[PDB]
Amino acid sequence: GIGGVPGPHNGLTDVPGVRVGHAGRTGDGWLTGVTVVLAPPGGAVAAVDVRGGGPGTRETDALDPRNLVQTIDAVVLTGGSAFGLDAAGGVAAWLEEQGRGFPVGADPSQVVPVVPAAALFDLGRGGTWRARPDAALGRAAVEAAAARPEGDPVEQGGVGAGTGAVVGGLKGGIGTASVVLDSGATVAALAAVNAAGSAVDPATGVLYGARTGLPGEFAGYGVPDAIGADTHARARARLAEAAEETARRRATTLAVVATDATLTRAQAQKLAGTAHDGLARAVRPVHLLSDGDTVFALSTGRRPLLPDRPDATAARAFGVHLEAGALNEVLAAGADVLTRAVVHAVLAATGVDTPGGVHPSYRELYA
Amino acid sequence: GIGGVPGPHNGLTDVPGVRVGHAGRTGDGWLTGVTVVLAPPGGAVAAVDVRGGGPGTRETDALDPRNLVQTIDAVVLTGGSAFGLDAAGGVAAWLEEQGRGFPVGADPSQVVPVVPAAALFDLGRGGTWRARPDAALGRAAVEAAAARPEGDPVEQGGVGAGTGAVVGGLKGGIGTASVVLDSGATVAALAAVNAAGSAVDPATGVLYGARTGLPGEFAGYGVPDAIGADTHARARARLAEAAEETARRRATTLAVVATDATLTRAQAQKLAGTAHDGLARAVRPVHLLSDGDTVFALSTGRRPLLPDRPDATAARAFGVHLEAGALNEVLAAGADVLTRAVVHAVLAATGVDTPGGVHPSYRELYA
């Protein structure tokens, strides 16, 4: 009864201790930003799965299950394509100042922060080609995460890494969702949706990810349950026109999935992997050479995976395995929270019109 | 142009020179079998992506892009869980008899066949726990493949590896689909569907994969595309009946994706990866610890990726890259054909009732 519903704010921060910060620059040629997910003091077990064919990434080898540093404090998601990876340097600097990183000496101030990053391509979308996130903007983002209270609703839409995100020609952005499992563990996702493929079924106008939604969760946005053939046809025409104008004017989904269920790094790497199936149910096509799709998975380690006295109803792989049963539930939830966070990204967005592109939002076309 | 429609029979053998063979055993305790995809003489460039958390496989390392043997002749999909991998030895023996394999000597008869295989769990579904595919059954499957003409319609349903296959409690089976690209290249999938998760949305009775179907392709199966609340209620209860009876009596999707577009092994390996997204769109949940989901990708290397009129209509990644654009189309097609093949598997199945299980088909419940 207590599972199958969202956590308190239906977002990443429903995983207690997890913090989210956005920093962006809009106007005067700029339409880009950075989003930082910051783990609670002491770090979180982290893993990654880079599945798109055209990634821009940093520090992903350090996250291999074989390797030395198992827990990290921060994950960076950034615009500005590979240049935007510069933002991570500013987050490492802040963490160092905070004394947070892997200890490399006797002096507890001697730490080396392991800061993975992934980037999305938004170059020129504000008008100025070289307007990209830098160290200072990465630092701003992590400082804003540190400044938030625990369990603060995550801000969605055209903010942080989603500031210049575009999804199938429509304005994309930041989206987030959570679910509580029957065990009391929370699983949640945050996504910066910048897909080259479409979040929208081109035959009907329906959001691919919608049917994975929990009851009523999208209502606060106000979108018809039937989409008329005419509404959809006008929408397609508008989008084709914004796309043609965008093109004349011009002369990847990044995600973090988190849970408070205690996962080893290998299990978190499997979670990052199953989250990609949630992405596939929300966007089509995905993971192509032109997509940089990357999922980071975090576990705060606060709840055991399996409760202390299992029922006949506890999930069991092959009828017998309780740990694998409990892990399957987390993995399937990882997919579902990412599908749902994609839909929220698409519904939370508002359109833009700059010298670097015209991108109407889903609601502007269908609401 | 000519793309976005099926090839002549809407199946793997639309990829010219590709052959499919099934051998199975039904009755007297048995409900299992083997399916072999047999490439044309000279072999096919092959790769693999094992994404399920509970695989049973053979000879997957030999298909790494870095390694020695880049082309192979046969891929084996088998029932019988890990025991059923024995079937591949019979296929290797037959290929050696044919002089087909990696040359290991000046003598042309001296070959070592690289025969990758994957297995699906169907133990005891015929009534007898130890009735599993063996080498003779694998040999029968590849002999059956070799005797087929080119372009032969693929047999679907409870045949071959699909003989004992079950998908979310419903009878699973073999399914297949193809699509032609604008280039004239064909991309196709064959799937043996045995998922622990569901091919059906539990709120509507709708097949997850259907909205990826090509218009009209499923019409022959005589299944409504809008399901009444009364039908759905009856179907749920019937399945739950079968499932309880199955449990009393007793008390993974494997796929080959092929194309004639010339691909490098690394390109085919990416294709085996994107195909898994198409599996995600047909089955939920998937890729879990209890799923042994495996995709093998084959290229017959008969048509260049690029034809020769690079119209402002030939796809281009980032507006400029012709080769990456053409590959993107194959990668996206690889996902879609596997989604559609899964639906065909579900629709082609007919139900079973044996001492080891009761598994009604989707059509028996919904049509």
Ligand SMILES: *CC(=O)CCNC(=O)[C@H](O)C(C)(C)CO
């Ligand atoms: C999906 C997307 O926005 C592409 C993200 N990747 C990049 O921007 C890379 O740095 C590219 C593909 C431009 C260069 O390797």
Ligand SMILES: *CC(=O)CCNC(=O)[C@H](O)C(C)(C)CO
């Ligand atoms: C998806 C499925 O049918 C299971 C395929 N894998 C197996 O049968 C393995 O051999 C198991 C998981 C039983 C043991 O490693």
